[PDB]
């Protein structure tokens, strides 16, 4: 996260860190005791056993409850950056309570409205190409950018009906590498997306692009 502040305990009861090979990698969202939602690109085709989920902590490396993976399922229409969601099943069930809870999802068919506030969180870099990453979870609030404006930035084909965008024209506030798969929420803390892709991080006039939960509820609902 670029331009962020430290998340407080319980800000995102459902957020998980996804370590890979013992190191930082991605974020995700705990949907129920045995299921995490993340970005497909975080997991597709990689060795499953390299991943470890942690819930209930502001750190990636201690606190809360861990699990390995039992299975990975990417969206059936995943292609390039499009439809960038995956369902992970956990080898260890994670109970709600305390600072752990399960995500509530954006309604099917919903689409975040330009100008509304959104908050994104993760353990990723604090600058584009940064090598260091924070111990504790960061968050940042950015407005939704209309799909039309986002298509002006990236091209028409590049931004689909299963993506939405968020950021500020001046840049300086965004998700970045290592934040992929983690949550973006609306102002009510309802999960509206997963961190997906963008041109660099926090660049002027290049929004962050998010996989849209509202557009992808059939997949999520079927397999969660």
**Residue position matching structure tokens 């992970």:** 88
**Do residues 174 and 210 share a domain?**
yes
Q: Distance (Å, rounded) from C-alpha 117 to C-alpha 49?
A: 36
84 catalytic residue (yes or no)? yes
List residues bridging with 36 in a β-sheet. 30, 88
**Do residues 96 and 199 share a domain?**
no
138 CB-contact burial (10 Å; exposed 0-12 / middle 13-18 / buried 19+): buried
**Do residues 95 and 108 share a domain?**
no
**Do residues 68 and 79 share a domain?**
yes
Element (H, E) at 26: strand 23-32
DSSP string over 172-218: --B--TT-TT-EEEETT--EEEEEEE-SSSS-TT--EEEEETTTSHH
**Do residues 107 and 196 share a domain?**
yes
**Do residues 86 and 127 share a domain?**
no
- Strands 183-186 and 208-212: what pairing? unpaired
**Do residues 37 and 88 share a domain?**
yes
Which pair of structure tokens corresponds to residue 133? Answer: 């990453």
Give me the catalytic one of 17, 29, 41, 186.
Answer: 41
Q: How distant is the alpha carbon of residue 117 from its chain centre? A: 16
**Do residues 59 and 126 share a domain?**
no
Look at the chain and report how many structural domains it folds into: 2
Q: Which of 224, 180, 168, 174 is nearest to 200 (CA)?
A: 174
CB atoms within 10 A of CB 70: 12
**Do residues 6 and 112 share a domain?**
yes
DSSP string over 127-143: STT-S---SB-EEEEEE
Residue 120 CB contacts under 8 Å (≥ 6 apart), including other chains: 1, 139, 140, 142, 166, 174, 175, 179, 182, 183, 184, 185, 195, 208, 210
Distance between the two ends of the chain, CA-based, in angstroms?
A: 27
Residue 103 CB contacts under 8 Å (≥ 6 apart), including other chains: 14, 29, 30, 31, 37, 183, 191
Please tell me the number of Cα atoms within 13 Å of 119 on its side-chain side.
Answer: 16
Q: Distance (Å, rounded) from C-alpha 70 to C-alpha 203?
A: 37
Report the CATH number that the domain containing residue 44 is assigned in CATH.
2.40.10.10
Which pair of structure tokens corresponds to residue 43? Answer: 């997991």
**Do residues 189 and 148 share a domain?**
yes
**Do residues 38 and 53 share a domain?**
yes
Which pair of structure tokens corresponds to residue 169? Answer: 């024209």
**Do residues 112 and 1 share a domain?**
yes
What range defines the domain where residue 122 resides? Answer: 1-12+103-214
CB-CB contact of 214 with 109 (8 Å): yes
Give me the catalytic one of 84, 174, 179, 186.
Answer: 84
What resolution in angstrom units was achieved for this structure?
0.9
Give me the catalytic one of 19, 180, 196, 207.
Answer: 180
Rg of the chain over Cα atoms, rounded to whole angstroms, equals: 16
Q: Is the dihedral of CA 64, 86, 27, 44 positive or negative?
A: positive
What technique was this entry resolved by?
X-ray
């Amino acid at each position: 996260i670029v331009g962020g502040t430290s998340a407080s305990a319980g800000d995102f009861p459902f957020i998980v860190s996804i370590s890979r090979n013992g190191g930082p990698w991605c974020g995700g969202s705990l949907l129920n005791a045995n299921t995490v939602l993340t970005a497909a690109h975080c997991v597709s085709g990689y060795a499953q056993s390299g991943f470890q989920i942690r819930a209930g902590s502001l750190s990636r490396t201690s606190g809360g409850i861990t699990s390995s993976l039992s299975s990975v399922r990417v969206h059936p229409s995943y292609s390039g950056n499009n439809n960038d969601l995956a369902i992970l099943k956990l080898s260890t069930s994670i109970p709600s309570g305390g600072n752990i809870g399960y995500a509530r999802l954006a309604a099917s068919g919903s689409d975040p409205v330009a100008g509304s506030s959104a908050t994104v969180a993760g353990w990723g870099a604090t600058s584009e190409g940064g090598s260091s990453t924070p111990v504790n979870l960061l968050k940042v609030t950015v407005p939704i950018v209309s799909r039309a404006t986002c298509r002006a930035q990236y091209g028409t084909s590049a931004i689909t009906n299963q993506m939405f965008c968020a950021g500020v024209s001046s840049g300086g506030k965004d998700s970045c590498q290592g934040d992929s798969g983690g949550p973006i929420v609306d102002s009510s803390n309802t999960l509206i997306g997963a961190v997906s892709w963008g041109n660099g991080c926090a660049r002027p006039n290049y929004s962050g692009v998010y996989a849209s939960v509202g557009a992808l509820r059939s997949f999520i609902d079927t397999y969660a």
